[PDB]
From Swiss-Prot:
It comes from the Eukaryota. This is Exendin-4. Venom protein that mimics the incretin hormone glucagon-like peptide 1 (GLP-1). It stimulates insulin synthesis and secretion, protects against beta-cell apoptosis in response to different insults, and promotes beta-cell proliferation. It also promotes satiety, reduces food intake, reduces fat deposition, reduces body weight and inhibits gastric emptying. Interacts with GLP-1 receptor (GLP1R). Induces hypotension that is mediated by relaxation of cardiac smooth muscle. It is found in: Secreted. It comes from Heloderma suspectum. Coiled coil: none annotated. The modification Serine amide is found at S25. The chain holds residues 62 to 86 of 87 of the full protein. Expressed by the venom gland. Belongs to the glucagon family.
Length: 25
């Protein structure tokens, strides 16, 4: 992937934009 993506996608796993967090990318 990118790893800087995996936690991004991980952000996204949480819901990214609606995850509660900001994006790790």
């Amino acid at each position: 992937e990118e790893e800087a993506v995996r936690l991004y996608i991980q952000w996204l796993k949480d819901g990214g934009p609606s995850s509660g967090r900001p994006p790790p990318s």
